[PDB]
Amino acid sequence: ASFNVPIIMDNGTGYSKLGYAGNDAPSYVFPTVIATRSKRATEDLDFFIGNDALKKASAGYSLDYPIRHGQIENWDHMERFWQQSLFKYLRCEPEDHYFLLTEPPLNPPENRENTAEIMFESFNCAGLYIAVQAVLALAASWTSSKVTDRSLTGTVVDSGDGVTHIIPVAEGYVIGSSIKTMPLAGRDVTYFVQSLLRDRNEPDSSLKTAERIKEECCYVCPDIVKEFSRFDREPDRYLKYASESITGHSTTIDVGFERFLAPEIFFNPEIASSDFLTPLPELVDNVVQSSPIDVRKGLYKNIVLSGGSTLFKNFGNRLQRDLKRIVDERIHRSEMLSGAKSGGVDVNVISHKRQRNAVWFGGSLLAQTPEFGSYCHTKADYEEYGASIARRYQIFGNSL
Amino acid sequence: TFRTLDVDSITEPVLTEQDIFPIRNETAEQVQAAVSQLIPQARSAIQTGNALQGLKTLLSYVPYGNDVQEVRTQYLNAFVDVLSNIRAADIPAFVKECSTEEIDNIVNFIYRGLANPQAYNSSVLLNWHEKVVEISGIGCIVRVLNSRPDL
Amino acid sequence: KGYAFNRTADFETVREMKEKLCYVSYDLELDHKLSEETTVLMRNYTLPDGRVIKVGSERYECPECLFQPHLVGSEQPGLSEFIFDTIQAADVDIRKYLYRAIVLSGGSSMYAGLPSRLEKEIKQLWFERVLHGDPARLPNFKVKIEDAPRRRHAVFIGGAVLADIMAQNDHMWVSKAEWEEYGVRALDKLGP
Amino acid sequence: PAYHSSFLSLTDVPTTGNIAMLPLKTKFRGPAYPADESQMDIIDECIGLFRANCFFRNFEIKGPADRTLIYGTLFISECLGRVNGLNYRDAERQLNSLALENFSIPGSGFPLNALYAPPLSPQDAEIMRTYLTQFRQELAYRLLSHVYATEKDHPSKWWTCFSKRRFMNKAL
Amino acid sequence: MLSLDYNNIFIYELLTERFSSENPSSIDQVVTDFDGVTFHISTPEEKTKILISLSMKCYPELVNYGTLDLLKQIYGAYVHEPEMGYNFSILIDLQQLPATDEEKEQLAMSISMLKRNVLAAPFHRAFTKQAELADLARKDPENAPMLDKQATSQELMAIHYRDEETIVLWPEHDRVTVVFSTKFREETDRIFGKVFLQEFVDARRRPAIQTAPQVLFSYDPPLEIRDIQGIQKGDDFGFVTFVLFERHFTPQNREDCISHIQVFRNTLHFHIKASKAYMHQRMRKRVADFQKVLNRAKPDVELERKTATGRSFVRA
Amino acid sequence: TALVCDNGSGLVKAGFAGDDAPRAVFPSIVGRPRHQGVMVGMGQKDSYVGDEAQSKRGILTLKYPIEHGIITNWDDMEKIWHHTFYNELRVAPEEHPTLLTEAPLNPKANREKMTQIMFETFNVPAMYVAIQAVLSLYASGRTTGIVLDSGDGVTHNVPIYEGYALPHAIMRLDLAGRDLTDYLMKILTERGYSFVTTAEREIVRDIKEKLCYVALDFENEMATAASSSSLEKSYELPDGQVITIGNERFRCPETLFQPSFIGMESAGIHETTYNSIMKCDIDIRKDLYANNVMSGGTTMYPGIADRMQKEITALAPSTMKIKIIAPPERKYSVWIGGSILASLSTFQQMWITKQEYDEAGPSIVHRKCF
Amino acid sequence: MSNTLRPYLNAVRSTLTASLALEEFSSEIVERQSQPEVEVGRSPEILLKPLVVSRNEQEQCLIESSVNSVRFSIRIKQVDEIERILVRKFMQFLMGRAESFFILRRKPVQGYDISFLITNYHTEEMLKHKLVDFIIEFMEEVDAEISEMKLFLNGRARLVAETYLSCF
């Protein structure tokens, strides 16, 4: 492999985190959005991305998010997003560098195939590793890079903008049969905040204002009928949020029960959706109880949080208490049949200083390894087998 | 692991092409002599400018077999050389006077010619294909699809 | 593929979809070739909602968890290797009679091509583990899967036979008068 | 999940069709048995749960107490549709007029005629109407004490926002 | 983008943040650039003090062409001892900044512009020596041919600035000539790059851009570079020549001309990549044309009416 | 399927994409009681909509929320849209995309509030706003022509050549069937009959819809009516008393050809059509003249197509064939062409979607619906 | 385009239309299953002989045929390295859409640029004369499509040259 630093690109549904292996942060963290125009033809040169795309809606560009619900679904826009990432922001030559890419555990064979042909034929990268994204978020949880600080067994709950998935990993191996996914994350709680501002007919219900009300005003409560009652009993529970309009004037928004009812989307997904029903503490139980019996203590002892939509105030404490309730009720059913007390299991949900970008920090830490260039597809593999080299699922069991 | 071991190839032997098509009732040197008598007539008919009679005589017998590629390719060299020397205005009058079996042999050997363009001129074989299919219909190609694999 | 079926009512919908569209691949690298090189495996299914879903490799990839249990997280051997390890544990004098009558039963035996795959995969497993890859004796190994049309109901149809064989033999059944004096020890009649 | 009626834990409760004629605190005339004035009853429960329950899109009914809580939940959605822009006094007269006016019972345009039983006799229909009229008059009067709690000449926006939150996509 | 930025965008945004920031956090950031260049940005002793260091494989050649003198002239009191593994370094102290937002902005710009400032010294050496030769040729026009002939060999700069590009340049009394001994090693970029290099030279023959530097192209080397060490006439290099005349490096235009000529092969490389995204949209547009030729094989049948989620509908 | 809602100034016309005709067609009216509500109970309401307002009208003040193609009252327009979805079509609007319509040269805010109410009040999955005359050209089976569309509140001309609109040549005229109804009230007053209330304005609209017609030569018809009983005929009011009228039958529609009858300084609908053709580039004019497409209820008068052809033949050079296309279904051509458009497969990519509105706000309509 | 291609595309049309006499046929090697027999090859009596139609050494068809399936594969004109890149990538976008063009393969057979599989079901559910019209209209146009793409590539190489060279 080349001696140049690998380039790390976590392309999320909400945000892309771009940087180089071994740095103390991503070089860029900006929305996974493209601004596109809607006698020589140049409208495919005229686009913008990230923070510079958000500035272009008033100039008549159509904004789009080429990743939705965790999966790339517009390969024209994702190719233009990557070329602009590589040549504007990272300012790099693909021929000199190995790349770490990411996508959700479910992601189609078709997506890794389409990713490999853009990377090896459009850009001609030296080599590509498409990582299992929340497996990197386990490695970001270490107290330091030294081997004695590693905890190679843990459940990881990743919750970004587009999807939340719970991954069991034990001794560094991903138990792919036990992956659970909930199709609801940080964007669906924004659409719920937006919908509640809109039901009150508030002066502003733009998407940025609903987003900023999540980041600043929202938190996870114990129980929504007790918390609705606390919003009768105590008057300063309602906040006032000052927002500036697209046409440049002030507004003031009263923010109310969406402060607790919007983060409740994870703990009662029947608020968000007709199609998904199991709450996150029961969904994490289903991951560990489908997983092999000898790893269950290790998977409960280390439940790592990952992705921006896990950062709600009191989120890890609600998950820990509700999962500890599920776990001890199941252990006590067995103690009451057997007539003897167990040792129990400690359920620990872990929030940590790198939790916001744990996939990128893990990708950086794993791409720093001396062995890394041997796990990549090299362009010499792609010259023989084409994009079919990337098609086989890494995380799940394959037939053949 | 067991999944990849081919058991079917030894426990259930499949039909061979000679179970579908009857065996050739002539030896390799017997057919090689029969074609070696015809190729000189086919060459000679070009020199007298009677290439139409060159085809009518060459077409009176056809070699077949997986044991006879050398004489099959010599017969195909003579066939494409004969078809290349017939004038394009003579083709409609000749095709309508061929039997269904002579037509079947013409459309079979223009197909063997079209399979190897570095040896054979496709432009004359496609001109012959247009006129033979126009006059005798689609069923002559259907007889080539259905034909023996060692023609 | 982005579809969702998490409602308790939708489990019967994918049961009917599986039961209509799934089949057992006879040759995995061939079905993977038809799957990855071709669109011929693609099929449309209409849900009782009226929604239409597209299904392709999942048609052979779903029932493959019977022949490869690791696909559903199980460490057990699949159908062919579970049946082979069972017959190959029987005494030498009876192994032939067990291979000459491998009787399939129950609805999950009904996938298209399952008898064909099972017979092949037992011949193929005897060729690996008994002949060590020597072709010369493989034609002499006889296996016969019994694969009757009625076999989804063979337990009922056989229960209706056995219940007639013991209908007049009133002592063969555990009695209410025997249950109320012995309790659960009345069931010790029902074999070892 | 959603919140069910604590009164599903009651037994030998009077019933019509499959509504439970639960103990009720009220001053309106009708058949409902007087509850204790010191304890929550189904209307303190129904209004207390409504603004959580109207967000859920899935609900499994445990018995006739929940069929009663659901009819109340659907009628609170009707009241919050009727109440908007009114003074507290105009709202009391409008929502009593709503409560009193001729409505469909189960077994007749009723929205949930698959989940509720028809009245068990020609006389069961009259006891079902005379209960549901008393219940929904009390339910209207009690709701107004919450939506006009802090101010008296305009309904609280913290209650009017549920006026389009159609419980389970059903309405009366 | 139709054109590349000249400066490192990360260094510009980071310094524009830290020069404004109320509370600077620490940093430890290795940052790549084009042509194998790399930067290290860090706070190695205090959060208050940022060290920016450049690594560049041709820096020893550039020092022979007066680079340290230009970097001391540009960065002044901020110049620092080189960091280990880096060729040049600058220390900026966040409590020692200029008194205005506009001086802070042009300092954040100046430090982001550092790759093109280290690489500008051979071009300033050529422009300033052309002004000496211009004055001597203005003194005696019949001696000028001999001054130009000796300056073509005695005042030539070659920079082997990456392993598949040599930039060669020299002054003569009326011009600076610069030759890019240029190559694409990736085979699809060599194929598209032949079209880009051909249409580049043919563009300069059209009336609309006669105001530009003269351009010439070949694939043997220009006569005056044929014996420069590391130029090779059979080794798949093309040779793009620019003749900058006095009007292309006039005092209002020198620094833009330097910035813009250094990025030549980088704009060509970038547009050879971006052309694939253009070809791909050209392709999938006529995949959608060929759909309409297959759609005429679908026999016409009415589908049942469906809601937006695909559920069946029972009206009309 | 998708809803098509041609919410015009005088009639709402609504239904489903791919249907032969609109299955909901009702007055674009909200009615409110103007009298003492003395009997308690009685099935009384705070307001009434459409055919319910039109049948109760003797006790109601009637008002249209839309005038000259512009929504003037959004609270009553939401009341009308609610009546379309829940009462008249009997659908969940959150289950169906909706194709809406408006006249060209409308205020920008009309399109914005119309998209906002569809996504935020009616919770629609997707919507689009089409220009009404562009829809009417699909209903003609044509991809070139000039469409003269005249409804209740607005008349407009849109020229289209080979699917390209010429937006500089588009004409609007804020004169159509409501101005003709008001003028019929003003001239009925001269023969003896006063119609004054918003309810009596519906009686004289019904007189206009079956007594009135366009004269081929106005001054000859005016002289023929001034000298004979033969142009006179009668109508019966709800009260059973009879109205007889004569030259009022063709003087009312003549206001489309002579807007000065209502005090307007504008060209008539014939000369406005010719001025739109003459604003187009010289090569396209021949095919516009051969394709004058009539639309909307104000084009339903007897003789108006024969008059329009006579008048345009005098303005155009005699060297070419003027043709006026006036289908018998032209009462609904905007809705018919909306049901064509909403059923095309490329149009399924042209919808504004819920997700895309939520990301962009109501300004998304100006950069997607043209 | 068809004056130079006419003899060739007439031979392709005639023999593709002869070859599409397809039928429902279940497998003789697997029970309760049917497979496109040309694509599996496990029972040779229901394979018809593979036919090559050719204009040139570089411009060729392979027609492979069976009781229930035809596989049709083509080599297309690629006279320079630009066309080798442009053709390969255009066929990859076209085969990436194969679910919506139901008779496309997702991969070509080795040594061919694009490939088609027409099965029994396609001859039952689609108009088979319009299937062979789509094949021949694709073969008629693809050389004009690819040549126009190298004009667009030339036009962009001029755009960046003129934009670059005009800002000195």
Ligand SMILES: Nc1ncnc2c1ncn2[C@@H]1O[C@H](COP(=O)(O)OP(=O)(O)O)[C@@H](O)[C@H]1O
């Ligand atoms: N403090 C916070 N509290 C709650 N949510 C947050 C917070 N900070 C960021 N988010 C949300 O996290 C999501 C982005 O997380 P990220 O991990 O970057 O998602 P992704 O990788 O899928 O794009 C957005 O919905 C964002 O608004």
Ligand SMILES: Nc1ncnc2c1ncn2[C@@H]1O[C@H](COP(=O)(O)OP(=O)(O)O)[C@@H](O)[C@H]1O
């Ligand atoms: N037969 C008719 N004769 C004359 N006017 C008519 C006729 N039918 C309808 N109209 C008039 O047309 C107008 C309604 O036309 P319409 O196209 O539905 O308008 P809109 O779309 O703007 O609501 C009303 O003024 C109505 O009286």
Ligand SMILES: [Mg+2]
């Ligand atoms: Mg993410």
Ligand SMILES: [Mg+2]
């Ligand atoms: Mg109208």
